[PDB]
Design a protein around this ligand. Structure first.
Ligand SMILES: [Zn+2]
Ligand SMILES: [Zn+2]
Lengths: 273, 72
């Protein structure tokens, strides 16, 4: 499995990828991922049990989630690998990512409805079932009201942070994990969710297929941070209440630890790192 | 702690009800949460903290564009 920059995919690779997403949607398997992710979005709190988000396990959790997702896609089409979206470079609504032969464009002004591409509600192929409001159609407001995606210099400022994470292991932390996630500082991951808008900015964000490409790039940035700081380990390393330590298992799988997920190369490689 | 409110904002009734504190839009509960810095998010605007539950309810009204909430 080789995860490529989305900007480098061929027309053929895009077709196979979107056909696999549409089949995974029809099977019901797609919505199971949305349900699981929504469960952790609602469940994870700063003061309580925190696993998928606002916690040191944000990174290995999403790594494992994406591996699961990509294995489900490969059961539809074994040639497919999740691509990544370098939003520092492909940073406008005019990027090839948002063409009709890939993810389709932004939402129309009236109701935010996506009107083109494979995921537009008019296709009948992308009913939004796992929802927080009555709307059954994919919505986006790409860069709405002049929102800007992070720059390369802003990404580099977070990659320079050598400490993986810090007590109190939540939205208040300094260190790489929380600055990458974006609850403190220049704000990388959170701000990108907001920039896409529509469901991607909500607690059912995996309804937008771009969710996977954003998280594949966040995952790649974790790999790049490890290359910059090879001696920086995952922390914490034991006995932290409500937090997944290095050698503890993560819900929902209960059979994998952060330690088992630090090296991505057992599962996939990148076109380039 | 969080201040109760009850008002119409862009054609939606938004409430913060104290018992337990809950935010409601047209009588349906908006799941909200407070970050340890005192800021608030909701399931309609999860990644963009604002200062107060009233601000969270108003952000949700803008996002919903007239749509009702469903149960969570
Ligand atoms: Zn998540
Ligand atoms: Zn995310």
């Amino acid at each position: 499995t080789v995860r490529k920059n989305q900007a480098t995919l061929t027309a053929d690779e895009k077709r196979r990828f979107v056909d696999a997403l549409v089949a995974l949607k029809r099977s019901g398997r797609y919505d199971e991922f949305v349900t699981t992710h929504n469960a952790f979005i609602m469940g994870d709190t700063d003061s309580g049990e925190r696993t998928g988000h606002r916690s040191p396990s944000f990174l290995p959790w999403h790594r494992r989630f994406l591996i699961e997702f990509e294995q489900a896609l490969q059961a539809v089409d074994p040639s497919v690998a999740l691509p990544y979206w370098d939003w520092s470079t492909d940073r406008t609504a005019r990027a090839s990512l948002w063409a009709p032969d890939f993810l389709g464009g932004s939402g129309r002004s009236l109701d935010g409805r996506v009107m083109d591409g494979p995921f537009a509600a008019s296709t009948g192929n992308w009913p939004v079932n796992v929802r927080v409001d009555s709307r059954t159609y994919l919505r986006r407001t790409l860069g709405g009201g002049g929102r800007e995606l992070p720059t390369r210099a802003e990404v580099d400022s977070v990659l320079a942070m050598s400490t993986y994470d810090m007590a109190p292991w939540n939205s208040a932390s300094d260190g790489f994990r929380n600055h990458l996630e974006g609850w403190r500082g220049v704000n990388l991951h959170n701000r990108v969710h907001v920039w896409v808008g529509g469901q991607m900015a909500t607690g059912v964000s995996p309804n937008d297929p771009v969710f996977w490409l954003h998280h594949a790039y966040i995952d790649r940035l974790w790999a790049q941070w490890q290359s910059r700081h090879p001696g920086s380990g995952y922390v914490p390393t034991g006995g932290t209440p409500n937090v997944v330590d290095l050698n503890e298992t993560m819900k929902p799988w209960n059979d994998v630890r952060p330690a088992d997920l630090l090296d991505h190369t057992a599962h996939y490689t990148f076109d380039t790192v | 702690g969080p201040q109760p409110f009850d008002e119409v904002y862009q054609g939606r009734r938004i409430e913060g009800r104290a018992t337990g504190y809950g935010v409601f839009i047209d009588g349906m509960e908006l799941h909200v949460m407070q970050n340890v810095d005192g800021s608030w998010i909701s399931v309609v605007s999860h990644y963009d903290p604002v200062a107060t539950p009233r601000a969270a309810a108003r952000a949700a009204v803008v996002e919903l564009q007239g749509a009702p909430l469903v149960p969570f």
